[PDB]
A paper describes a structure:
Our attempt to produce a binary complex with the substrate was only successful for SbCHI. From the early stage of refinement, the electron density corresponding to liquiritigenin that had been added to the crystallization buffer was clearly identified. The bound liquiritigenin, the product of isoliquiritigenin, a type II substrate, was surrounded by 34RGI36 from β3a, 44FTAI47 from β3a, 104YAGKVTEN111 from α4, and 147SI148 from α6. Notably, the molecule was surrounded with predominantly hydrophobic residues: Ile-38, Ile-36, Phe-45, and Leu-99. In addition, a hydrogen bond was established between the sidechain of Lys-107 and the C2′ hydroxyl group of the bound liquiritigenin. The overall structure of SbCHI was very similar to that of PvCHI, with an RMSD of 0.66 Å. The noticeable differences between SbCHI and PvCHI were observed in the loops between β3a and β3b and β2 and β3a. In addition, α8 of PvCHI was shorter, as the C-terminus of PvCHI was more disordered than that of SbCHI. The Vmax of SbCHI was 2889 μM s−1 and 0.238 μM s−1 for naringenin chalcone and isoliquiritigenin, respectively. The Km was 16.55 μM and 1.585 μM for naringenin chalcone and isoliquiritigenin, respectively.
Chalcone synthase (CHS) and chalcone isomerase (CHI) catalyze the first two committed steps of the flavonoid pathway that plays a pivotal role in the growth and reproduction of land plants, including UV protection, pigmentation, symbiotic nitrogen fixation, and pathogen resistance. Based on the obtained X-ray crystal structures of CHS, CHI, and chalcone isomerase-like protein (CHIL) from the same monocotyledon, Panicum virgatum, along with the results of the steady-state kinetics, spectroscopic/thermodynamic analyses, intermolecular interactions, and their effect on each catalytic step are proposed. The production of these value-added products also offers the prospect of increasing the value of the crop, especially because many of these compounds are soluble and readily extracted. This study characterized the enzymes involved in the first two committed steps of the flavonoid pathway, CHS and CHI, and the non-catalytic protein CHIL. Through crystal structure, molecular docking, mutagenesis, kinetic analyses, ITC, and FRET analysis, our study provides evidence supporting a revised catalytic reaction mechanism for monocot CHS and CHI and identified an intermolecular interaction of CHS with both CHI and CHIL in a non-competitive manner.
Numbering used by the authors: 3 to 213
The structure:
Amino acid sequence: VPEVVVEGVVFPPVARPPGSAGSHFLGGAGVRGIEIGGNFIKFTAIGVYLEDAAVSALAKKWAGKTADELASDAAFFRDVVTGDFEKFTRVTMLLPLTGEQYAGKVTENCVAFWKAVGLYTDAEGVAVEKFKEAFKPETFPPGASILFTHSSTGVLTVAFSKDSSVPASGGVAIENKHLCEAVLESIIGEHGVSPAAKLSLAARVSELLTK
Ligand SMILES: O=C1C[C@@H](c2ccc(O)cc2)Oc2cc(O)ccc21
Ligand SMILES: O=C1C[C@@H](c2ccc(O)cc2)Oc2cc(O)ccc21
């Protein structure tokens, strides 16, 4: 597949996460903004990479479905988020943000959505602290990156980079499945904070489930 660029940030078509040797391809890459008044104001550039073994797993169900057929099924996005494979996500800052300020928003969409469904156990609470701790001493000038590694077993790994480059040596590893998927679920889920990314991951992945 081809490279996807999001507002200058250049997400290459393949990438090996920090601490991994397998190859991941780029599922999709879109912008995240919020609605200041009435304007779409861009803050981050997100890319979602999926392990190569993922094409087989998803194709079991989604082969031959159009880009819009895939783009409209919340299952295609739940499958990806919770797929029994590895997922690598890079968040690149278009606007300046601080780790303390990034992690807060992510956890309040989670530790809230878990209280909406009664799944905010001492697990989530502990995972979100270790989460909110890895981000606290960091500030992300535009160009820096946040790199999450989602494992098949639900093990989140939080690396950082000064630029769009994925570092060689890994980061922290929060050993909780919900918080792992919550992070990804919050980017390309039903309430995904990046529908552009969903659009890219729907278009690209549809052209691979026909080959
Ligand atoms: O205007 C914003 C930006 C937003 C924000 C910070 C970081 C990030 O990554 C994405 C959004 O913080 C907010 C919180 C709010 O309740 C309402 C508006 C905003
Ligand atoms: O690149 C994008 C994402 C795109 C988008 C928004 C919402 C949605 O549901 C699907 C796509 O909207 C935008 C609006 C803008 O002014 C600038 C960039 C974009």
